[PDB]
Structures are given as structure tokens and as C-alpha cells.
Amino acid sequence: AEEFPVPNGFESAYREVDGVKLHYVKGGQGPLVMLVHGFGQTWYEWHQLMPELAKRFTVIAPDLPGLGQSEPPKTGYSGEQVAVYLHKLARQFSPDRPFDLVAHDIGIWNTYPMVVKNQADIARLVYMQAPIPDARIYRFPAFTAQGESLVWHFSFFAADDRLAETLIAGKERFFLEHFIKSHASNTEVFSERLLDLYARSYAKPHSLNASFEYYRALNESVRQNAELAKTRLQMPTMTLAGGGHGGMGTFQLEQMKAYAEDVEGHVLPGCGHWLPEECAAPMNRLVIDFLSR
């Protein structure tokens, strides 16, 4: 039983990290690159990049704790707690050399603490489509002159009483299609089959709850990061952001400039939030080139 199709030459496997059984898909040879997905998705969002990267690198794509086929965390869902799991997972496979890190959406939240605290273990960093949790997220408007905003899910998912689980249960496929397409610039890349796969995966009760616990921990992650951010990142970093509807535009690079000394960014026109699927080829190309320099 696999929730998503594994590409040729890759292996679906599990590893215990601090008592928590983590699922991942792994292939390739060479220095290690870890790819970390975001909300609504799983390791599978990288399935197009992974065979290309695996020509020059060892590639590992974990499911975040509680999501996909990984067990929920036993400590908690703030960035610092989850980052321990992802760091220790990567160390098992690259204990003698730095590794590269590519992260999308809440993968950023869940990896930034381990990067800033183990800078010598990270060779190069790619961050795409999510603010690092800090005071800036408090400025994002709740409502726009065009209709619903793109960040009101922060409060919906953070709300207590299990509000999001209760309202979305029974309607997981419907809600996820609306959520994805409303943050997408190009909706045609999400077939009905792909949406069925993602919806069945996050509809598992523990995965549905886990998805929102990351947001229930968001303010704790902001407070954690106010102390972490006294140390700027020193490794080579690239940011990617969509330039169309759902994309973060210039905010991604401009925020990262406050955290990183050596940073380059790109904004991809015609693309929204789901860069690996909406703009697979140009994103794949910029990732591979940046990590191969």
C-alpha cells in the first residue's frame, strides 16, 4: 500500500527518528538533497524534480510528521520541534558531509530552525512560497477588493474546537480542490486524479488533524524565530515565488534578505503557489542549476 506512485529507481522506506516513524522516498547517488513538501501535499509534489536531481544527487523526499505516511510527532508541531526530526533524518543519510535543502510552504516553517542552528550541515538552501514565520505575517490582509484573500486559512486552520477538521471532514476532496485552485494561477495542471490522491491522503483523520496543528503552532514558531533570527544564514540561498495569482511575488526574496547574507531570488510569471506542479520545468531547471553550481 502506497499513497502515491514511486518513480522508477526510487525506494519508499521508513526510518525511526526520536521514536517517530518517518516515511520518505529516496533515490540517486552523490551528495544529499532533502526536499520537504507543504500543506495539502506529500513527498509526491517532488516526483517530477526527483528523477532529474537524482542524476547528480542523492535525493530524499520525506512526508512531514503526521502527513502522508509519516507518524505524528511526539514532541509537537512548532517549527523547532519538527525541525529536529527532519535534521536527524537527513543526518542518518549524510553524517559526513553537508546536505542541500529544498522546502516549499510549511516545509520552510519546519526546516528554518534546524538550518539556522546547524549551518555547517547545510551546503545550499532553496526556499519557495511561504514566509518564514515572523511578525510580517500579521500584516497580511484578511479580505481583498477582489474577494477572498490567500492567507485567511491561517486563522481558519489555527482556530480551536477542531473547527477545520469538523467542517472539512466529509468534504475533504471538495475543500482541497477549492483550496488548491484558489491559490493556483494555472488550474489545469491539477487533474481530478491528482486531486483524488492528495485528498485521500490528507483525509486520514490523524493527517487531517496534523495538517492544522502546524497552524495551531504558528504563533509559537513566530516566537521561536524571534530568538533564532539573531543569527543570519551564511550558506548560498535561492528563493522562488510565483508571479501570478496565488504567488508571493517580491515578498519571498525581500523577506529572505533579512535572514540570509548570500541570497538570490526569482519570480515566475504565470505561476501561483504550487510551483512544482504549475511551473515544473522552469522551477526544476532553476533548482538543479543553483544546486549544481
Added chain:
Amino acid sequence: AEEFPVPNGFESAYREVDGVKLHYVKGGQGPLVMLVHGFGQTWYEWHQLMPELAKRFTVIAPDLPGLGQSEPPKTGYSGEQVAVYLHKLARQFSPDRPFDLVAHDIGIWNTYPMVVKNQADIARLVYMQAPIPDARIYRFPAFTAQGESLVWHFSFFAADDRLAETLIAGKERFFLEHFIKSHASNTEVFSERLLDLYARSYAKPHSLNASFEYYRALNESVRQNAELAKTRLQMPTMTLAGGGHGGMGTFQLEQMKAYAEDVEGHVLPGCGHWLPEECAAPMNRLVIDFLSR
């Protein structure tokens, strides 16, 4: 056939206005005062203030179109379309004299245009707990350092594909309790019995949909008021806002000073959104004193 208990000496009745049958509760004698409820509730939110006002006033409390026992509007749900219905209803009972207006929450949205277009018809005005729809609402934050903001429902309710009705159907009783209490400071007044009453009213399918149609017309209402705001209100007005969790605090009066020449404002400590219920004694006293001047 009453969704809520009519107070002693009042009558539940209906008036056809522009093809639309509006429900209302009415009692008392003297100059007319109209009380307009907001989202999540009906005329019944006024049922404690009405017996007191009726000692000196003719009091009418209609259900907004689509909500309570009132038919949906045949024109639409923008502030200027709904305000026609309420102006016409009031003027059937007060054709020869100005009347007083008290509005709560989206009652403000649905009365402001008729007040500015017919200033000689409004003797005194009391607005509580809502922004008048304008560009200020596009700066309300999606997310706060305390947690979920109070205004993210703007985007939730406005979202297309009938997102809100689709998620909330079958869970209307659960959602109303969460929504009401999360916007309250004095939550203990929302007994299960009272929550049952309001939930069975807005859970009527055309009422659940009507509820969100007001938010789907909000951007139109914003654009309508942009023209109308070029003329400031000339009649004595009072604003009330909660000072506690769910209250709008100083925003209510500060925004109203841009719209009204003659305006006094009160912030009530320990009270959130639902002033008639959370803080009946101070609120009723404030409204009665203001209107009797």
C-alpha cells in the same frame, strides 16, 4: 409559527415590500424606532431592549431578507439593495415623521445607504459593532499574535463555489456556537438553549445561503458607499463597541467620525461582539438615554 418567543404586548407579523415578505416584531406606541439585527442572529437579539423602548416608542424589529422568517431579497444583497427594503418597511409605519434607527453588525451595512440618501427620515442613529463597508476593511489582518483574527470570516463567507454552505451544512449548530463564542468576552450568556434557537433559524438552507450572500456583496457595498460617503451624516448618532474579546474598541467611533458630524461613542469593557446579550444592562441604558434626549 414562531422561531422565537415574542415578548408580552408585541406582535409577530409580515409586510410585503417590493415583492418581498419581511417578518417583523412590533409593539409600543409613539415615535418609531427600528432595530436591525446582524449575522448569526434575528430580531430576537433585541427582545430584552424592546419592552423597555416600547414604554416610550413604537418599536419594530424586522428579520433581514433571507434571515429569520423574512423572504430573500429579489434585487440582491448589497447594502444599497437591502436598504431599500428596510427604508420602505419603516416608512409604512412612519410615513409622516422621521424615525430612529439602531443597527448591529451587518444591520449597519444594510441601513447606511438608506440613511445617507434619506437623511430627513432618520431622527437619531445608533450603530454598534461593525465597520461601515469601505476600503478600511482591506487592511484588517488575516492573522494576529493572539491567534485567529476576528475578521477572517469575511473571506470564508465571500468565497465562491458555495464554500461556506458546503462546509457548514450538517454542522450549523456546531459552527454557530464556535463563531458566536469566539467573538464574545462574556461567553456564558450563550446557553445551549439560546444557541439551539439561533441555530435552527440560520440552518434553514435559504437562510444559510442568505447569510453568506451579504458577504459576497460586500465588495459591491464598498464600491456603492464610495460614492455615497461624499455626503456626511447630519443627524445625531451614537456608536457602541465592545472593549473585550471580539470587540471593535476605538475603531467604531474613529471610523464613524469620518462619516458623521454629530457623533458620540462608547466602548464597553468586558464585552465583545454581542452587546445586547453580553452586556444588556449598560447597553440598553445607553440606547434608551440616547434615544430619549
